[PDB]
Design an enzyme around this catalytic site. Structure first.
Site, mmCIF file in Angstrom:
data_model
loop_
_atom_site.group_PDB
_atom_site.id
_atom_site.type_symbol
_atom_site.label_atom_id
_atom_site.label_comp_id
_atom_site.label_asym_id
_atom_site.label_seq_id
_atom_site.Cartn_x
_atom_site.Cartn_y
_atom_site.Cartn_z
ATOM 1 N N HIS A 1 0.812 -1.212 0.000
ATOM 2 C CA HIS A 1 0.000 0.000 0.000
ATOM 3 C C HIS A 1 0.850 1.268 0.000
ATOM 4 O O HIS A 1 0.358 2.327 -0.410
ATOM 5 C CB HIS A 1 -0.939 -0.008 1.209
ATOM 6 N N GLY B 1 -0.625 5.268 11.127
ATOM 7 C CA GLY B 1 0.813 5.117 11.066
ATOM 8 C C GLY B 1 1.324 3.758 11.486
ATOM 9 O O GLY B 1 2.532 3.518 11.402
ATOM 10 N N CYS C 1 0.554 0.876 10.051
ATOM 11 C CA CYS C 1 0.656 -0.028 8.911
ATOM 12 C C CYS C 1 2.060 -0.606 8.808
ATOM 13 O O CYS C 1 3.052 0.122 8.886
ATOM 14 C CB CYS C 1 0.294 0.724 7.617
HETATM 15 C C1 7YY Z 1 -6.681 3.781 12.725
HETATM 16 N N1 7YY Z 1 -5.836 2.687 12.266
HETATM 17 C C2 7YY Z 1 -5.704 1.520 12.861
HETATM 18 N N2 7YY Z 1 -4.861 0.782 12.145
HETATM 19 C C3 7YY Z 1 -4.477 1.518 11.101
HETATM 20 C C4 7YY Z 1 -3.511 1.041 10.045
HETATM 21 N N3 7YY Z 1 -3.495 1.901 8.880
HETATM 22 C C5 7YY Z 1 -2.397 2.824 8.661
HETATM 23 O O1 7YY Z 1 -1.512 2.935 9.423
HETATM 24 N N4 7YY Z 1 -2.390 3.655 7.482
HETATM 25 C C6 7YY Z 1 -3.460 3.533 6.555
HETATM 26 N N5 7YY Z 1 -3.456 4.350 5.377
HETATM 27 C C7 7YY Z 1 -2.308 5.205 5.235
HETATM 28 C C8 7YY Z 1 -2.377 6.581 5.250
HETATM 29 C C9 7YY Z 1 -1.186 7.304 5.090
HETATM 30 C C10 7YY Z 1 -0.962 8.669 5.067
HETATM 31 N N6 7YY Z 1 0.340 8.865 4.886
HETATM 32 C C11 7YY Z 1 1.215 10.014 4.776
HETATM 33 N N7 7YY Z 1 0.961 7.620 4.788
HETATM 34 C C12 7YY Z 1 0.010 6.661 4.911
HETATM 35 C C13 7YY Z 1 0.069 5.242 4.894
HETATM 36 C C14 7YY Z 1 -1.119 4.535 5.052
HETATM 37 CL CL1 7YY Z 1 -0.640 2.811 4.972
HETATM 38 N N8 7YY Z 1 -4.540 2.628 6.752
HETATM 39 C C15 7YY Z 1 -5.600 2.546 5.778
HETATM 40 C C16 7YY Z 1 -5.293 1.389 4.826
HETATM 41 C C17 7YY Z 1 -4.065 0.736 4.851
HETATM 42 C C18 7YY Z 1 -3.843 -0.315 3.967
HETATM 43 F F1 7YY Z 1 -2.648 -0.981 3.954
HETATM 44 C C19 7YY Z 1 -4.838 -0.691 3.084
HETATM 45 F F2 7YY Z 1 -4.609 -1.718 2.224
HETATM 46 C C20 7YY Z 1 -6.061 -0.046 3.063
HETATM 47 C C21 7YY Z 1 -6.279 0.997 3.944
HETATM 48 F F3 7YY Z 1 -7.475 1.656 3.949
HETATM 49 C C22 7YY Z 1 -4.571 1.800 7.928
HETATM 50 O O2 7YY Z 1 -5.482 1.073 8.058
HETATM 51 N N9 7YY Z 1 -5.063 2.687 11.158
#
Ligand code: 7YY
Ligand code: 7YY
EC number: 3.4.19.12
Lengths: 301, 301
Positions: free
Chosen positions: A41, A143, A145
């Site tokens: 991702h 963050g 992920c």
């Molecule tokens: C609330 N929560 C609980 N667990 C998580 C895990 N998570 C995450 O950490 N980040 C995500 N989206 C990103 C946004 C970014 C913005 N910037 C600058 N960089 C980013 C990197 C990510 Cl990875 N997501 C959402 C998400 C991550 C995926 F790997 C996916 F396949 C689908 C998704 F909808 C996330 O769930 N957040």
């Protein structure tokens, strides 16, 4: 004495955690030998995350589009590939603190330790069970992920989970370290529902044995039940049916306590039918199902 | 989202754990710079443990009576002294993985991470609260003596607990890293009782705020209460009385959720009086009191 949710010491994994940034998107990676593993991702821009075609997105990148940071030192990417939902970034430096490791996929009902990490920096550690519906009830913020889950046997780290996303119910979904999702999920930023769950019966029984080992015996009784008679009650309370192979795994605990598995089942049947009547078991007021028989044997004596 | 008992990553402490053997008695020590810290109980033979005079026992030892093992390498003891209930063994090698550290004593109601260790080898990690009666509800077996508890702020490890003994109720007692016991205990192998305990009210309220942040709101209500009217209920249910200084610490959580502290107290008063009526809060069926306001803020958003 005592019984606690207890994680493996996390030091061996802490030394492998890095930050991976692609453009403005950033998350955690796992640095083993000269390869960094992370959710694919990361190659999505904000406008790619809803409906990515990862093969398209990846062919449009080169090694220099990936910023990998192991603390203060930048690791130079010298190759990149996709394996299912994980990106593999070959780097020019082998991690000098690579532990002996394996990539293993776990079964529902089994437990592992999660090292929650943010911007490549470990934040906290806790135990999780893989639910029957292939989600985990974790604690994760934005963050996280790329955080990983693992078990440690002797000196070998068996990595079993890479965190991807949070579902709308607040539970968490991810893949094994081969990038294959646990459960019917895809790495898109769309709302996806978990299937119906159920209670892990053998874990509840294992936890009741832990309680007897630790001196809670108020729930025991003189009755026994048949395997089929218990399963009629289990089906009514959304407990998964009990098999002889499960009676078998509880063998050592049944022997230590001298309480027959089917006798302990009569206790569980009563607890399900009567509640707990203001009392507690190992400090809980409900029936705990996230301890495996191995977790009990590892912690009790 | 999600809320879990979560320990600090333990790697920084794992690298400091050693085995200390004196004759046939063996336990864990903490190796920082060129000093190993461990329970002075290690100088007791089996027949000294009931009624030791430690000053006597120690003057009868020399450095060569102490075997210190950091994994496979033996550390040479070059000096020994007593500070209250901890032995300090000066060694010829400074620990190359000494983290930035402090020795801090914690207050009852505060939390810390415990790295359970056996024969100098870390085994598991979990969170504990110092109870009002200065015991901790840990998970420890034979051989855990000398395991340490700690918190990590940025890169600095604040050591706050050295494990000594298990009391007859199954709870655990120990000292700070200056060797001063928490609570009215002494390092003798005699049965010692903990004093009466009480529930940590501000932690329960902090945990209810964590629940609102995480979407459990069924327990909220339109009522408010006075500080003194709540304390009349708290005294009946063995909750510790609530003060304005505690209303103050809950300020940021009250602001994030928009629920006045005294409003949240009306909820707690109802929960204490009515029970929970088959429902759960953050996966628990009882009121959890081992999360501090800081633990909630660290984990929620
Ligand atoms: C609330 N929560 C609980 N667990 C998580 C895990 N998570 C995450 O950490 N980040 C995500 N989206 C990103 C946004 C970014 C913005 N910037 C600058 N960089 C980013 C990197 C990510 Cl990875 N997501 C959402 C998400 C991550 C995926 F790997 C996916 F396949 C689908 C998704 F909808 C996330 O769930 N957040
Ligand atoms: C069940 N449990 C839970 N926590 C503990 C901690 N604990 C411990 O690990 N060891 C102890 N006594 C020893 C025996 C030894 C036998 N050999 C070869 N070496 C030994 C070393 C010890 Cl330290 N104790 C008992 C104990 C330890 C003290 F430090 C003390 F001051 C009084 C005590 F009664 C113990 O509680 N066990």
């Amino acid at each position: 004495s005592g019984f606690r949710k207890m994680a493996f010491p996390s030091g061996k994994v802490e030394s492998c955690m890095v930050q991976v940034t692609c453009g403005t998107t950033t998350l955690n990676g796992l640095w083993l030998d000269d390869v960094v593993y992370c959710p694919r991702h990361v190659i999505c821009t904000s406008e790619d995350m809803l409906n990515p075609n990862y093969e398209d997105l990846l062919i449009r990148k080169s090694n220099h589009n990936f910023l990998v940071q192991a603390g203060n030192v930048q690791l130079r990417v010298i190759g990149h590939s996709m394996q299912n939902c994980v990106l593999k970034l070959k780097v020019d430096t082998a991690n000098p603190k690579t532990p002996k490791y394996k990539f293993v996929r776990i079964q529902p009902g089994q437990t592992f330790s999660v090292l929650a990490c943010y911007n490549g920096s470990p934040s906290g550690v806790y135990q999780c069970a893989m639910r029957p519906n292939f989600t985990i009830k974790g604690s994760f913020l934005n963050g996280s992920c790329g955080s990983v889950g693992f078990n440690i046997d002797y000196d070998c780290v068996s990595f079993c989970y890479m965190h991807h996303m949070e579902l709308p119910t607040g539970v968490h979904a991810g893949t094994d370290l081969e990038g294959n999702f646990y459960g019917p999920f895809v790495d898109r930023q769309t709302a996806q529902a978990a299937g119906t769950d159920t209670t892990i019966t053998v874990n509840v029984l294992a936890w009741l044995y832990a309680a007897v080992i630790n001196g809670d015996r108020w729930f025991l009784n003189r009755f026994t039940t048949t395997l089929n008679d218990f399963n009629l009650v289990a089906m009514k309370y959304n407990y998964e049916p009990l098999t002889q192979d499960h009676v078998d795994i509880l063998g050592p605990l049944s022997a230590q306590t001298g309480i027959a598995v089917l006798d302990m089942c009569a206790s569980l049947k009563e607890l399900l039918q009567n509640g707990m009547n203001g009392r507690t078991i190992l400090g809980s007021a409900l029936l705990e199902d996230e301890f495996t028989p191995f977790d009990v044997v590892r912690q009790c004596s």
